[PDB]
From a paper:
Here, selenomethionine derivatization and mercury soaking have been investigated for SFX experiments using the high-energy XFEL at the SPring-8 Angstrom Compact Free-Electron Laser (SACLA), Hyogo, Japan. Three successful cases are reported of single-wavelength anomalous diffraction (SAD) phasing using X-rays of less than 1 Å wavelength with reasonable numbers of diffraction patterns (13 000, 60 000 and 11 000). We succeeded in experimental phasing using SeMet-derivatization and Hg-soaking techniques at wavelengths of 0.954 and 0.984 Å, respectively.
There are two monomers in the asymmetric unit and each polypeptide consists of 164 amino acid residues, of which three methionine residues were replaced with SeMet (Bijvoet ratio ≃ 3.7%). Of these images, 26 583 (75.3%) patterns were indexed and integrated using the CrystFEL suite, with sensor geometry refined by geoptimiser. At least 13 000 patterns (a mean multiplicity of 74.3 at 1.4 Å resolution) were required for SAD phase determination. When the correct hand was used in SHELXE, a mean FOM of 0.649 was obtained, and 285 residues were modeled with CC = 42.5%. The electron-density map for the correct hand was readily interpretable.
Numbering used by the authors: 97 to 249
The structure:
Protein backbone atom coordinates (compact mmCIF):
# COMPACT_ATOMS: atom_id res chain seq x y z
CA UNK A 1 0.00 0.00 0.00
CA UNK A 2 1.09 3.56 0.73
CA UNK A 3 1.71 5.92 3.61
CA UNK A 4 0.48 9.49 3.48
CA UNK A 5 3.32 11.56 4.91
CA UNK A 6 3.07 15.22 5.86
CA UNK A 7 6.19 17.11 6.95
CA UNK A 8 6.43 20.71 8.14
CA UNK A 9 9.57 22.83 8.56
CA UNK A 10 9.61 26.39 9.90
CA UNK A 11 11.34 28.82 12.25
CA UNK A 12 9.29 27.92 15.30
CA UNK A 13 7.55 24.61 14.63
CA UNK A 14 8.06 21.20 13.09
CA UNK A 15 5.68 18.31 12.77
CA UNK A 16 5.38 15.02 10.94
CA UNK A 17 2.12 13.21 10.35
CA UNK A 18 1.78 9.70 8.97
CA UNK A 19 -1.62 8.59 7.65
CA UNK A 20 -3.25 11.60 9.32
CA UNK A 21 -1.73 10.96 12.75
CA UNK A 22 0.88 13.25 14.32
CA UNK A 23 4.03 11.29 15.24
CA UNK A 24 6.24 14.32 15.91
CA UNK A 25 5.22 17.80 17.02
CA UNK A 26 7.57 20.40 18.42
CA UNK A 27 6.18 23.90 18.85
CA UNK A 28 8.25 24.84 21.92
CA UNK A 29 9.81 28.30 21.80
CA UNK A 30 13.51 27.70 22.52
CA UNK A 31 13.78 23.92 22.31
CA UNK A 32 14.26 21.49 19.46
CA UNK A 33 16.48 23.52 17.15
CA UNK A 34 18.13 21.63 14.31
CA UNK A 35 17.41 18.68 12.06
CA UNK A 36 14.73 16.29 13.25
CA UNK A 37 15.07 12.79 11.86
CA UNK A 38 12.40 10.11 11.89
CA UNK A 39 12.98 6.55 10.67
CA UNK A 40 9.99 4.42 9.66
CA UNK A 41 9.65 0.71 9.04
CA UNK A 42 9.15 0.33 5.29
CA UNK A 43 6.41 -2.31 5.55
CA UNK A 44 4.32 -1.07 8.48
CA UNK A 45 5.12 2.61 8.84
CA UNK A 46 5.96 2.13 12.52
CA UNK A 47 8.40 4.63 13.98
CA UNK A 48 11.78 3.00 14.56
CA UNK A 49 13.66 6.08 15.78
CA UNK A 50 13.12 9.77 16.44
CA UNK A 51 16.12 12.05 16.94
CA UNK A 52 17.01 15.71 16.85
CA UNK A 53 20.48 16.95 15.97
CA UNK A 54 21.22 20.57 16.82
CA UNK A 55 23.44 21.17 13.82
CA UNK A 56 23.52 24.87 14.63
CA UNK A 57 25.96 23.72 17.34
CA UNK A 58 29.32 21.94 16.97
CA UNK A 59 29.63 18.13 16.96
CA UNK A 60 25.95 17.36 16.35
CA UNK A 61 26.57 16.69 12.66
CA UNK A 62 29.06 14.00 13.67
CA UNK A 63 26.40 12.32 15.80
CA UNK A 64 23.97 12.54 12.90
CA UNK A 65 26.42 10.88 10.49
CA UNK A 66 26.99 7.99 12.91
CA UNK A 67 23.24 7.59 13.33
CA UNK A 68 22.38 7.71 9.63
CA UNK A 69 25.13 5.24 8.74
CA UNK A 70 23.53 2.68 11.04
CA UNK A 71 20.05 2.98 9.53
CA UNK A 72 19.34 -0.09 7.39
CA UNK A 73 18.90 0.23 3.62
CA UNK A 74 15.21 0.34 2.76
CA UNK A 75 14.08 2.29 5.82
CA UNK A 76 12.03 5.41 5.20
CA UNK A 77 13.86 8.56 6.33
CA UNK A 78 12.14 11.84 7.16
CA UNK A 79 14.08 15.03 7.91
CA UNK A 80 12.80 18.44 8.86
CA UNK A 81 14.47 21.62 10.09
CA UNK A 82 13.46 23.80 13.02
CA UNK A 83 15.01 27.29 13.19
CA UNK A 84 18.57 26.67 11.98
CA UNK A 85 20.32 23.50 10.85
CA UNK A 86 23.25 24.63 8.70
CA UNK A 87 25.85 26.50 10.77
CA UNK A 88 27.73 23.37 11.85
CA UNK A 89 26.49 21.05 9.13
CA UNK A 90 29.89 20.24 7.73
CA UNK A 91 31.15 18.57 4.57
CA UNK A 92 31.00 14.95 5.73
CA UNK A 93 27.33 15.30 6.72
CA UNK A 94 26.50 17.16 3.51
CA UNK A 95 28.17 14.43 1.44
CA UNK A 96 26.08 11.85 3.29
CA UNK A 97 22.86 13.75 2.54
CA UNK A 98 23.95 13.93 -1.10
CA UNK A 99 24.43 10.14 -1.12
CA UNK A 100 20.82 9.75 0.05
CA UNK A 101 19.71 11.69 -3.02
CA UNK A 102 18.92 14.98 -1.31
CA UNK A 103 19.40 18.04 -3.49
CA UNK A 104 18.61 20.69 -0.87
CA UNK A 105 20.35 19.13 2.13
CA UNK A 106 23.89 19.49 0.77
CA UNK A 107 23.05 23.11 -0.07
CA UNK A 108 21.38 23.95 3.24
CA UNK A 109 22.08 27.53 4.32
CA UNK A 110 21.53 29.91 7.21
CA UNK A 111 17.96 29.67 8.56
CA UNK A 112 16.73 27.80 5.47
CA UNK A 113 13.70 25.55 5.93
CA UNK A 114 13.82 21.99 4.60
CA UNK A 115 11.66 18.88 4.55
CA UNK A 116 12.78 15.55 3.07
CA UNK A 117 11.23 12.10 2.67
CA UNK A 118 13.26 9.31 1.11
CA UNK A 119 14.21 5.65 1.22
CA UNK A 120 17.70 4.82 2.42
CA UNK A 121 19.36 3.53 -0.73
CA UNK A 122 17.03 5.67 -2.83
CA UNK A 123 14.82 6.95 -4.28
CA UNK A 124 13.80 10.31 -2.80
CA UNK A 125 10.01 10.60 -2.57
CA UNK A 126 9.69 14.30 -1.88
CA UNK A 127 11.76 17.30 -0.89
CA UNK A 128 11.04 20.99 -0.31
CA UNK A 129 13.37 23.85 0.57
CA UNK A 130 12.98 27.57 1.20
CA UNK A 131 16.03 29.82 1.23
CA UNK A 132 16.17 32.55 3.86
CA UNK A 133 16.10 35.95 2.10
CA UNK A 134 18.39 37.68 4.61
CA UNK A 135 20.61 36.98 7.63
CA UNK A 136 17.99 38.42 9.96
CA UNK A 137 15.18 36.30 8.49
CA UNK A 138 14.12 32.66 8.09
CA UNK A 139 13.03 30.68 5.06
CA UNK A 140 9.29 30.45 4.46
CA UNK A 141 7.52 27.56 6.17
CA UNK A 142 7.44 24.48 3.97
CA UNK A 143 4.75 21.83 4.00
CA UNK A 144 5.64 18.65 2.13
CA UNK A 145 2.91 16.11 1.44
CA UNK A 146 3.93 12.90 -0.26
CA UNK A 147 2.83 9.31 -0.71
CA UNK A 148 5.38 6.67 0.28
CA UNK A 149 5.13 3.18 -1.21
CA UNK A 150 5.19 0.35 1.33
CA UNK A 151 7.08 -2.90 0.90
CA UNK A 152 5.02 -6.08 1.13
CA UNK A 153 5.55 -9.20 3.23
O1 LIG B 1 25.04 38.36 14.49
N1 LIG B 1 24.99 36.98 14.60
O2 LIG B 1 26.06 36.21 14.20
C1 LIG B 1 23.84 36.39 15.12
C2 LIG B 1 22.78 37.21 15.47
C3 LIG B 1 21.62 36.66 15.99
C4 LIG B 1 21.54 35.29 16.17
O3 LIG B 1 20.38 34.79 16.70
C5 LIG B 1 20.32 33.43 17.10
O4 LIG B 1 20.12 32.66 15.92
C6 LIG B 1 19.96 31.26 16.17
C7 LIG B 1 19.82 30.56 14.83
O5 LIG B 1 18.63 31.02 14.16
C8 LIG B 1 18.75 31.03 17.07
O6 LIG B 1 18.60 29.64 17.38
C9 LIG B 1 18.91 31.82 18.37
O7 LIG B 1 17.74 31.68 19.18
C10 LIG B 1 19.14 33.29 18.05
O8 LIG B 1 17.97 33.84 17.45
C11 LIG B 1 22.60 34.45 15.83
C12 LIG B 1 23.76 35.02 15.30
Amino acid sequence: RVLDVEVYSSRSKVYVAVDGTTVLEDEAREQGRGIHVIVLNQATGHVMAKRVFDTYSPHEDEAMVLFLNMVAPGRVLICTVKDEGSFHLKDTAKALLRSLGSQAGPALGWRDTWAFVGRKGGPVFGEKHSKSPALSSWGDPVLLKTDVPLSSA
